[PDB]
A paper describes a structure:
The proteasome of the malaria parasite [name] (Pf20S) is an advantageous drug target because its inhibition kills [name] in multiple stages of its life cycle and synergizes with artemisinins. The 20S proteasome core particle is composed of two antechambers located between an α-ring and a β-ring and a catalytic chamber centrally located between two β-rings. We recently developed a macrocyclic peptide, TDI-8304, that is highly selective for Pf20S over human proteasomes and is potent in vitro and in vivo against [name].
The overall binding mode of [name]-vs in both sites is similar, following an anti-parallel β-strand configuration resembling peptide substrates. In both β2 and β5, the inhibitor is covalently linked to the catalytic Thr-1, the two indole groups at the P1 and P3 sites are inserted into the S1 and S3 pockets, respectively, and the P2 Leu and P4 morpholine face the catalytic chamber. We compared the β6 subunit structures of the wild-type Pf20S and [name] mutant Pf20S, and with the high resolution of the two EM maps, we clearly see that the β6A117D caused a one-residue shift as well as an upside-down flip in the Gly156-to-Ala161 region. In the wild-type β6 structure, Tyr158 points upward to interact with the small hydrophobic Ala117. Also, the aromatic ring of the Tyr158 at its new position hydrophobically interacts with one indole ring of the [name]-vs. Especially, the hydroxyphenyl ring of Tyr158 interacts with the indole ring of the P3 Trp of the [name]-vs via an offset π-π stacking with a favored vertical distance 3.4 Å, which likely explains why the β2-specific inhibitor [name]-vs also binds in the β5 pocket of the Pf20Sβ6A117D, supporting the observed enhanced inhibition against the β5 activity of the Pf20Sβ6A117D19.
Numbering used by the authors:
A (entry chain I): 1 to 221
B (entry chain Z): 1 to 211
C (entry chain H), H (entry chain V): 1 to 82, 89 to 103, 109 to 252
D (entry chain a): 26 to 240
E (entry chain b): 2 to 138, 147 to 265
F (entry chain K): 1 to 195
G (entry chain J): 2 to 119, 126 to 218
């Protein structure tokens, strides 16, 4: 996995790759690693996919309940508190490294959260197995008050670095731009990997080539 | 693996399956588990394929030099003793070998089971591999010393088929060789057990067979 | 990690490095290890980030409760009514290089009527850490000002013991390298400038010698009436020899 | 208070082999990797032993390099001593001896020895790092073997198909190998980048190159 | 050697229009303790070959002594400049050493770069070899050396060995390697190569706890092997959010 | 180890077990009777494993099934009985496992003669022939070979005789004493066989 | 893993043009190499448009199927409507994660139809795969699970063809399953293939290898 | 244990504590960790006492061999021909308290004709330690004077690596506490008195902060022509604050 996030002027840009791996085997080529917590808050996940999916769904629905009850705008700090308290409660056994980004009254905010329940407020961050390549790109090219387009290009470059230098990363580049008034989720954003060789014609098996022992037909009503 | 051998009124019947595996992955379905050590001795191998093949070739070299020097054919007992002593010298190193040596010599038809632990058991009927128990049951339920060649070949084929059917480590093709005074013949070069199942257990092919 | 606290004539100065690392990789370049519990109370964290952060969150919640319950009924202090500045720009100037590196705020509770006590907060933290010392592993330095004992430093050690320091406290992996330096250079009733220079130099030496210490330097100066905070980025150590 | 050092690593790789009436094909991916990193994107896994024989190995790169060099040295010494080039069967026995010599500290290498013999028939030998098996039609070693071997079984043996096909030629076989390596690159993280395809036939050894996904 | 005690961090070597540029920081760490701050981690084998290491200093010194004596024997037997050993030869030697020690399970806890010029057609430096006096420290232009005439090779603990246009060890193998796979190009000038290497070293200094910004650069060119004057890399933070005071953030929550 | 054998035909079910009660290196009894649990309404649970777990699980299941049948004034179906047994074994697997193998035989009008094979991990499935123990390796192929549809009770008993002879001849534990339960013609019969 | 190797088993799912297919191996194993049953189906019908293929430990398969049937039946009786395929997939994910730290050793797939209303109704093929703690992979072409996952992935990557009628879909899925099973020691002994069409379901047993 | 070496303008000064402890018990109160290899060559030992002592014995034997082989044939230097004092009594004076605490001897080899080289002895020691680094665990500081490189300090580290120090070297558990102190206080071309005070203070601070360092302080001053040795027993650390 390569997930990353950065803060540009009045927006937070998150990016992710789309590969899920079961040992050395790619279990999913186009998994979605960017999750909507609220209209102004999103997260990117790395680690154990089941833990990430369950925890992000739980956070999303708890945040929506809180928003309905308080009748106010959700807060990245509230998401951070809930997530860190849960992860600490489980003592790192829910393997969830999260890049949580959102815009609230305090402006754009980006957090890195680690499985044991620590958090840090950052201008940019990267997590996953490709995190070191993404961090190389981000450290080389990041600057304050970048335009949204520049931030999108930088996030794409970081995720591509992760994809092409880490064996646990691959697929497409998904991006999400979060502002105080809207989010734009581009999936896919790059599509840099495709199967390169195809046979001249697809192999269509002739009818009746498979031997069968029995055939029962039932009609659905 | 399923390898078996037994003495009967016309010589020795030797039979094997053809499946190799690493873990749960079937690496091959056409390996040769019966080898000829010399003109009048056949060895059936089970366990570690590399160990079995290497040490059978070693035994063949030793037997060739012995026969060249002494102008006589080696006996199955002597070959089994040589192999067992060699294997015992490596006890505690991890060799995996179960070899049935069956042959004809001046003392008639002889058959020995040799292990990597240095065992050497003389006998009239042996079976080795992960299907050995199933092959043993089938052979014991219907064995007779006065079987004709065709009956003996059928018994060996049936035992190998049942071993392959019940054991996940055995399968592929079944080979049956016949050792007689003048050498050995390959009665069944290799026969897919697919046809054996659909001829023995599910001849009708009207539904899935229920074990 | 290096966290230090020093008591000078008119206040208490806390300082810290800002490197959080997972082994040899630096996960956070510039973390925030000095954290405000109350307007007049700060804590420096060392050890596991998750442990120290969650403990400090709980303690901030407790301190809010304590401050609310400390308030008395009525009106008070009706007839009663309650220096050298650090050249931070000069300190940070580098030839080869809208940046904010200094903050200052005055206490809202001028008379310390309801502000909790440094000892109270430190001891509740110690009790929390000791009840779970089978799991938690963090070391804290509480620096604060209260009207009873004035400026105070408390060390909450690993395993959950508490020692009040009357001169200075150090903690983290980098403090070992500056142990004798600080012992030699410390004196009683230092001025603000002397204390600032000493604590900055201590953090700089610790960062020079310790691989787990790096980044910028954060300093908090707590006094009777206000709190100042500085960030130092001129952290390189230059030796003539 | 030190941790023990493990003398084995896997550097990834896939080597496929496919025989024909008078030709043999050996394809191998060129990526070299260590855990989740790439050491280099071009580390050939196939070495030429004779004008009619090559060997491709997958496993620990240092073991593969040493073993290929040792085999080449043995073959050159054989040529000098017995004044003729060994054929693939002699080379197979030689490699078997070399491999069992280290039986109790085996080379971490799975190897396919491909060649054409005096009858002009394609020959493949599969080595599990200690022993040899002659492969009738096709073989595969490395990380993608479990993905690839079923495909080649379906396309070559066609045992589970009543309506079978038998027109097998060099171009169609090359296309089959390309498809197999591409499909393996789809799901195997250690297979990718470039692949080298060697065809040995009456005219000798010819090497072509195919591009794979770089993720 | 059961394991690393005193260690050096990453090394970076690249090809450029005039030869090899190899860089490493002059720091050796005894754990998390930066005990030695002026350590030499790049060694000259001969006039066309250098060796860089990351890992145990003791094993690196052992290998350096082996290579020094190998070079002395080569020089003793030399009759013409073509007789001098090449970087490829030394890379093969080191790879064989590592392989044998792996087989014995007595490894050197090191990753090695062997770099240099694989040709004798660009200068006459090996006509008269001086070991104890460096005439370089009288300035003629550098020679544009073909990329195929240059050599950079990598050897690891398990004997895995290869060569490329640029080689990295340690954490460079992530940060500098990403930057090089993005931005490296053929026939870079000296200043461009130095700028790329400096970017890589700055990222390493920011993200690697065992590195320093006291850098040693070595150039293998037609002039021979040149050690540059060690310099302090300027490393400034790339964001003002780092410097923003903590007291200016909201006092509630996990703002740290 | 206790060898259990089960054979299901169109008109019968035969269960067989060795009659040894083993305690370390000595046989407490050659006529053990702690393996068969007959349950009213033509059901039988044949258990194999440690005697303590065998007794506890067998009696628990038998008393629960008898309670069900008394409370509901009806005979539990064989499928319900088998899956109830499997559900209880699975429930206890992750808490305090019984180390018992089960052959569940029975007859009912809805489904006729039924045989279910269940292992100590609670992996169950209905079968025509099954076995448990280290003698399974030696009797399974005999069952496979000599079993056919439309087999009779006497032919099944001949197959069982072959199995017992094999267990006496080739099995490490020379087992010679067996008990058989035969369900056919809505009657349950007990037999004792010695080879 | 070894717990999956204890029984073996594999499930596969493929999509066509207005049809889906779900296939499974019919073996039940013991100790990773003993075949005790050859009719242990791993495909379960939840309702007309939802099928689940469960592979892994047999006891966990049966337990999970009972739980899923309980939940689906309660949901459907309460709502007076058939459960949606997406709703069932999410419920299965949540059930699997509810045992996160003591999980069921089952690797399931969900194959079915998503119904879209406009008059007429549109049937959209739906495939999902899971890991044992509910991580979900939603796919449009094919899903695999079991000990034969690598072989199935290779076969489906090479042979899957988009937008096939029921006949071509059946041929493709059966060929993929048979070729993948031929290379697994602990899977096989018969294959069951269901082809779902909006108006009918075709159930076929394949003439497979039994070795 | 604390061993230090410093290079000043006219020589090299080694210093050490003298505590050998088996855990928390002090087996030897006043051990001798600075040992003479040759008249102009000394070694400070740290780590396992058995390992360092046996290594030093072997190296002394080797150095005897080297010195014997270094002697040339004939006569030499026919026409050729080849100070602030430390107040040791004042340094050791204690109010609440035939004692010998100072020695001095001149080199017999005035011209360094056959005395072995500091680098040679240090490198043979390093080779011996590296060949058995699977077993041996000791750290050594060689301080010496030879006519080629004058005063020299070599550090032979754990695992058998050698680093020449041109300013100072430290080793042992107590050196960590004085790392920054020595770095701050050191300067180039110190006088003998400055170097003596600095090294004495370094050992005193290390002993104050380290439980494994204690006892008296032994100092050896190696110069071009002689070697002086001092024992300091006024090791208590007094802080005004
Ligand atoms: C990033 C990689 S990494 C190396 O940095 O951990 C990804 C992040 C990821 C993948 N998918 C999502 C979805 C949403 C958010 C984030 C996501 N992580 C992974 O891919 C996991 C890496 C391992 C090392 C933990 N892989 C998984 O969790 C596996 C996913 C999976 C396996 N089979 C499947 C079938 C269908 C769909 C998904 C999968 N799962 C496992 O490894 C299962 N283990 C079992 C034991 O408990 C832990 C999970
Ligand atoms: C019988 C099975 S058994 C369970 O009774 O041991 C067979 C007997 C057999 C197989 N092949 C031959 C050839 C000649 C004579 C006899 C033969 N035994 C096996 O198949 C082995 C079973 C293991 C448990 C010991 N398997 C093997 O030895 C593997 C064979 C193999 C591996 N890759 C191949 C590719 C093609 C053809 C065959 C093979 N080899 C190993 O498992 C050795 N491992 C390989 C992985 O690295 C470590 C060594």
């Amino acid at each position: 996995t390569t997930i990353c996030g950065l803060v540009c002027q009045n927006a937070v840009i998150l990016g992710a790759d789309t590969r899920a791996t079961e040992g050395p085997i790619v279990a999913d080529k186009n998994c979605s690693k960017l999750h909507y917590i609220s209209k102004n808050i999103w997260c990117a996940g790395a680690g154990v996919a089941g833990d990430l999916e369950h925890t992000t769904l739980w956070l999303q629905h708890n945040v929506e309940l809180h928003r309905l009850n308080t009748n106010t705008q959700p807060r990245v700090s509230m998401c951070v508190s809930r997530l860190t308290q849960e992860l600490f409660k489980y003592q790192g056994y829910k393997v969830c490294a999260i890049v949580l980004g959102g815009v609230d009254v305090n402006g754009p905010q980006l957090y890195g959260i680690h499985p044991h329940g620590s958090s840090c407020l950052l201008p940019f961050t990267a997590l996953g197995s490709g995190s070191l390549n993404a961090m190389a790109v981000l450290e080389a090219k990041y600057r304050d008050n970048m335009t949204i387009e520049e931030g999108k290009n930088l996030v794409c470059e970081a995720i591509c670095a992760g994809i092409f230098n880490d064996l646990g990363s691959g697929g497409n580049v998904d991006i999400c731009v979060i502002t105080k008034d809207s989010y734009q989720h581009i999936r896919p954003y790059k599509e840099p990997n495709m199967r390169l060789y195809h046979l001249p014609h697809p192999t269509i098996y002739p009818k009746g080539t498979t031997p069968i022992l029995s055939e029962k037909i039932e009609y659905i009503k | 693996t399923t390898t078996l051998a037994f003495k009967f009124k016309d010589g020795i019947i030797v039979a094997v399956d053809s499946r190799a595996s690493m873990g749960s992955f079937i690496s091959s379905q056409n390996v040769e588990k019966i080898i000829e050590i010399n003109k009048n001795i056949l060895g059936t191998m089970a366990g570690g394929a590399a160990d079995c093949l290497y040490w059978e070739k070693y035994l063949g070299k030793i037997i060739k030099i012995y026969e060249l020097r002494n102008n006589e054919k080696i006996s199955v007992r002597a070959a089994s003793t040589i192999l067992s002593n060699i294997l015992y010298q490596y006890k505690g190193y991890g060799l995996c070998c179960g070899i049935i040596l069956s042959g004809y010599d001046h003392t008639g038809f002889n058959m020995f089971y040799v292990d990597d632990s240095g065992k050497k058991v003389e006998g009239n009927l042996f079976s080795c591999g992960s299907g050995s128990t199933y092959a043993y049951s089938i052979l014991d339920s219907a064995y007779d010393y006065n079987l004709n060649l065709d009956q003996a070949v059928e018994l060996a084929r049936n035992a190998i088929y049942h071993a392959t059917f019940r054991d996940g480590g055995s399968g592929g093709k079944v080979r049956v060789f016949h050792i007689h005074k003048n050498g050995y013949d390959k009665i069944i070069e290799g026969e897919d057990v697919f046809d054996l199942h659909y001829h023995y257990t599910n001849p009708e092919q009207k539904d899935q067979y229920v074990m | 990690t290096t966290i230090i606290g020093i008591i000078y004539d008119n206040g208490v100065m806390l300082a810290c490095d800002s490197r959080t690392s997972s082994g040899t990789f630096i996960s956070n370049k510039c973390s925030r290890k000095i954290n405000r519990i109350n307007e007049n109370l700060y804590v420096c964290r060392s050890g596991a980030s998750a442990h120290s952060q969650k403990i400090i969150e709980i303690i901030k919640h407790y301190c809010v409760s304590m401050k609310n319950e400390n308030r008395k009924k009525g009106r008070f202090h009706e007839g009663e009514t309650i220096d050298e500045e650090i050249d931070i720009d000069s300190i940070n100037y580098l030839d080869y290089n809208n940046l904010v590196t200094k903050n200052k705020y005055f206490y809202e509770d001028k008379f310390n009527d309801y502000n909790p006590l440094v000892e109270n907060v430190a001891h509740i933290t110690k009790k929390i850490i000791y009840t779970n010392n089978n799991f938690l592993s963090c070391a804290l330095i509480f620096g604060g000002y209260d009207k009873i004992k004035k400026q105070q430093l408390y060390a909450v050690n690993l395993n959950g013991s508490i020692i009040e320091k009357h001169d200075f406290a150090v903690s983290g992996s980098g403090s070992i390298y500056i142990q004798s330096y600080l012992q030699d250079k410390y004196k009683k009733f230092m001025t603000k400038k002397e204390c600032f220079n000493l604590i900055l130099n201590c953090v700089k030496y610790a960062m020079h010698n310790d691989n787990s210490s790096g980044g910028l330097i954060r300093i908090v100066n707590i006094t009777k009436s206000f709190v100042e905070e500085f960030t130092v980025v001129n952290t390189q150590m230059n030796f003539q020899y | 208070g030190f941790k023990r050092w493990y003398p084995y690593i896997d550097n990834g790789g896939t080597v496929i082999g496919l025989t024909g009436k008078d030709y043999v094909i050996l394809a191998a991916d060129t990526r070299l990797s260590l855990s989740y990193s790439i050491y280099t994107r071009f580390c050939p896994k196939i070495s030429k032993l004779t004008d009619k024989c090559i060997i491709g190995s997958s496993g620990m790169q240092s073991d593969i390099k040493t073993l290929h060099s040792l085999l080449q040295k043995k073959i050159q010494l054989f040529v000098l001593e017995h004044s003729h080039y060994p054929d693939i069967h002699v080379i197979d026995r030689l490699l078997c001896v070399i491999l069992y010599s280290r039986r109790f500290f085996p080379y971490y290498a799975f190897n396919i020895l491909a060649g054409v013999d005096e009858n002009n028939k394609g020959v493949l030998y599969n080595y599990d790092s200690v022993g040899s098996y002659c492969e009738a039609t096709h073989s595969c070693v490395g990380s993608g073997s479990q993905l690839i071997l079923p495909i080649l079984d379906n396309r070559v043996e066609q045992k589970n198909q009543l309506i079978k096909n038998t027109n097998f030629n060099l171009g169609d076989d090359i296309n089959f190998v390309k498809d197999a390596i591409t499909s393996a690159t789809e799901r195997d993280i250690y297979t990718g980048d470039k692949t080298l395809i060697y065809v040995i036939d009456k005219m000798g050894i010819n090497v072509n190159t195919l591009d794979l996904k770089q993720d | 050697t059961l394991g690393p005690v005193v260690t050096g961090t990453s090394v970076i070597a690249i090809k450029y229009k005039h030869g090899i540029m190899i860089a490493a920081d002059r720091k050796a760490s005894y754990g998390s303790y930066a005990k030695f701050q002026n350590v030499e981690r790049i060694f000259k084998i001969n006039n066309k070959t250098v060796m860089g290491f990351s890992g145990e200093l003791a094993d690196a010194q052992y290998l350096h002594e082996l290579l020094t004596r190998k070079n002395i024997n080569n020089l003793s037997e030399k009759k013409r400049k073509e007789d001098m050993y090449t970087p490829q030869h030394y890379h093969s030697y080191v790879s064989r050493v590592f392989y044998v020690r792996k087989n014995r399970i007595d490894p050197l806890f090191n990753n090695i770069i062997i770099a240099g010029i694989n040709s004798q057609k660009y200068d006459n430096n090996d006509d008269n070899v001086l070991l104890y006096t460096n005439k370089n420290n009288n300035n003629e232009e550098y020679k544009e050396i073909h990329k195929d005439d240059l050599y950079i090779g990598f050897v690891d603990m398990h004997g895995t060995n290869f060569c490329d246009d640029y080689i990295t060890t340690g954490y460079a193998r992530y940060f500098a390697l990403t930057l090089l796979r993005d931005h490296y190009k053929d026939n870079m000038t000296e200043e461009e190569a130095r700028i790329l290497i400096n970017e890589c070293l700055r990222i390493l200094y920011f993200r690697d706890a065992t590195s320093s910004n006291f850098i040693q650069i070595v150039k293998v060119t037609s002039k021979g092997v040149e050690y540059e004057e060690p310099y302090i890399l300027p490393c400034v933070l790339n964001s003002a959010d780092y410097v923003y005071p903590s007291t200016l953030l909201p006092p509630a929550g996990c703002m740290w | 180890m206790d060898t259990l054998i089960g054979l299901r035909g169109n008109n019968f079910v035969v269960l067989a077990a060795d009659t040894y009660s083993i305690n370390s290196i000595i046989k407490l009894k050659n006529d053990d009777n702690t393996k068969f649990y007959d349950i009213h309404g033509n059901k039988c649970l044949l258990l194999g494993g440690s005697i303590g777990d065998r007794l506890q699980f067998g009696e628990f299941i038998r008393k629960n099934v008898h309670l069900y049948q008394y409370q509901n004034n009806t005979d539990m179906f064989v499928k319900s009985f088998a899956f109830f047994t499997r559900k209880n074994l699975a429930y206890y697997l992750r808490r305090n496992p019984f180390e018992v193998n089960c052959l569940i035989a029975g007859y009912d009008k809805k489904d006729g003669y039924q045989l279910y094979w269940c292992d100590y991990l609670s992996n169950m499935d209905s079968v025509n022939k099954g076995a448990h123990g280290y003698g399974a390796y030696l009797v399974s192929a005999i069952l496979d070979k000599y079993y056919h549809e439309n087999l009779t009770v006497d032919e099944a008993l001949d197959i069982f005789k072959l199995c017992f002879e094999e267990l006496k001849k080739r099995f490490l534990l020379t087992q010679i004493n067996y008990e058989l339960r035969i369900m056919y013609d809505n009657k349950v019969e007990t037999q004792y066989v010695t080879v | 893993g070894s717990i999956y190797n204890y029984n073996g088993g594999c499930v596969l799912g493929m999509s066509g043009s207005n049809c889906v297919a779900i296939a499974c191996d019919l073996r039940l194993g013991a100790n990773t190499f003993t075949t005790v049953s050859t009719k242990f189906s791993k495909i379960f019908k939840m309702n007309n448009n939802v099928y689940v293929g469960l592979s892994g430990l047999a006891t966990d398969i049966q337990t999970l199927y009972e739980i899923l049937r309980y939940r689906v039946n309660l949901y459907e009786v309460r709502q007076d409507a058939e459960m949606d395929v997406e709703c069932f997939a999410n419920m299965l994910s949540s059930i699997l994660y509810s045992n996160r730290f003591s999980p069921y050793f089952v690797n399931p797939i969900v194959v079915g139809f998503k119904l879209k209303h406009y008059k007429k109704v549109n049937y959209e093929p739906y495939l999902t795969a899971y890991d044992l703690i509910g991580a979900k992979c939603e796919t449009r072409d094919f899903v695999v699970n079991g000990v034969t996952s690598e072989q199935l992935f290779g076969m489906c990557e090479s042979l899957y063809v988009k937008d096939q009628d029921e006949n071509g879909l059946f041929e493709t899925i059966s060929q993929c399953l048979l070729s993948a099973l031929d290379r697994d020691c602990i899977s096989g002994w018969g294959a069951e293939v269901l082809v779902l069409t909006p108006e009918k379901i075709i159930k076929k047993k394949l003439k497979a290898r039994m070795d």
